């Protein structure tokens, strides 16, 4: 119809399809990432033309709006680090109503829709996602990334050094979409990145949110996603050093 | 016999076995990591008693010497991030002659022996490992970790090198980082404070893949594609980290 449940199914299906295509195209090809990225963007646009005729598409290169990234984690893709993803978000008035992130190398798909919860789908079927119940920020495993391009990186690194001793450990994986899903699944306790494009966090953000996580999205965005027991304590430490703004 | 080729086979086999056991034990159990870590240590010690009778064993908790870590990446193991490894190194006089690192969730095994090259073994059979041919440190993908107190200084140091490199990866397993360098999935790796049983095997593997590797109670580890090693060592010294 156009309800969240319907929107997430098309999101799940397209994500899974596109993952299969990326997985296959990468093997053939191996600029080279530009090729697969474009090809997969084309696949998604065409499939959306047939499944969702009049719907707007905001791509990485250009009523519900489909916000997408065929390959989030392009560095990872080029190096063969199994941590790149297809992200498909369904937005209405700038709010994400449904979404799906496909972990290409893992052959799994995370998805969610407003009010309906977040699930992970793999060979063993579909599972409910729930973030962790950490209380002490010194017990939290935090993921981060460098957002945008080479400009303004050392400051972000400087900021992180300050938060490093306040937390259990840090992870830097190379994919914003996948970090948001880890938080949802409980593989990270929180995630923080400064400068994330909308098409890389829109889907994941919802997924983490529907998994009970605290999520705030302040040309990129500032993203904070954390288990609820630890969100305030983390936001304070970040503000304390200027990062959540 | 006791030659590198023989030493690496027993390393490969033990790594593969132990990975299978960890993979199984983790599913049962899910302190909880302490349990699996000990159990797997016991498996390796017993198997080494039967395959390599008189050989000394330096474990994470205690003529060739088998240096080993049943689960490198214990935080990863606990959270379900597929990046923990079994590491088995064969040392003679403190020098690593052969080694194997099993990537437990990937179901793959990396191995090497002095003069015999580094290989990766997976479903598609055995492959030769070679690190990348990067020249510009600004083009290099660098992996890091923290080894152990004092963490903020290490982070401070990294912020300085961050703009000199393509991007940074922090995965949670030194054994796996060294193997990623060998495979070409990272261009270099740097960590300050790495126990011997987490880097001995990987260090050899990266080295046998053509990487520049130096090991300065833990150790300082630098492993990099050759075309970029000097340039990286300089930047590190320039901020005090390779010491």
Author numbering:
A (entry chain A): 5 to 34, 54 to 85, 98 to 253, 260 to 286
B (entry chain C): 5 to 34, 54 to 85, 98 to 183, 186 to 253, 260 to 286
Sentences from the paper on this structure:
The structure of M. tuberculosis SuhB was determined by molecular replacement to a resolution of 2.6 Å. The asymmetric unit of the crystal lattice contains three independent copies of the SuhB monomer forming two crystallographically distinct dimers: chains A and C associate as one dimer, whereas chain B forms an analogous dimer with one of its symmetry mates. The dimer observed in the crystal structure of SuhB is primarily mediated by helices α6 in layer V and the β-sheet in layer IV, which extends across the interface. Due to the absence of divalent metal ions and of substrate in the active site, the loop connecting helices α1 and α2 is disordered (residues 35–53 missing), as is much of the loop connecting strands β3 and β4 (residues 85–96 missing). The active site of SuhB is situated in a cavity carved out at the N-terminal end of helix α7, sandwiched between layers II and IV. Due to the disordered α1-α2 loop – referred to as the 'mobile loop' – the active site in SuhB appears wide open to solvent. Structural elements of the active site required for metal and substrate binding include the IMPase signature motif 104DPXDGT109 (superscripts denote residue numbers of the SuhB sequence) between strand β4 and helix α4, the 82GEEG85 motif at the 'tip' of the β3-β4 loop, the 209G [ST]AA212 motif in the β10-α7 loop, in addition to Glu228 in β11 and the 234WDXA237 motif in helix α8. All conserved side chains forming the metal binding sites or contacting inositol-1-phosphate are seen in essentially the same conformation as in the human/bovine enzyme, with the exception of Glu83: as a consequence of disorder in a large part of the β3-β4 loop, Glu83 (h_70) in subunit A points outward rather into the active site. The interface of the SuhB dimer buries a total of 2696 Å2 of solvent accessible surface, calculated using the PISA interface server, or 1348 Å2 per monomer. The present data support a model of Mg2+-dependent dimerization, where loading of the three catalytic metal sites in the active site induces ordering of the mobile loop, promoting dimerization likely by expanding the dimer interface.
Synthesis of phosphatidyl inositol is dependent on free myo-inositol, generated through dephosphorylation of myo-inositol-1-phosphate by inositol monophosphatase (IMPase). In contrast, SuhB appears to be a bona fide IMPase with little or no activity towards fructose-1,6-bisphosphate. Like the human orthologue, SuhB is activated by Mg2+, and inhibited by lithium. Apart from minor discrepancies, the SuhB monomer is identical in fold to eukaryotic IMPases, with RMS deviations between Cα positions of superimposed backbone structures ranging from 1.09 Å to 1.15 Å.
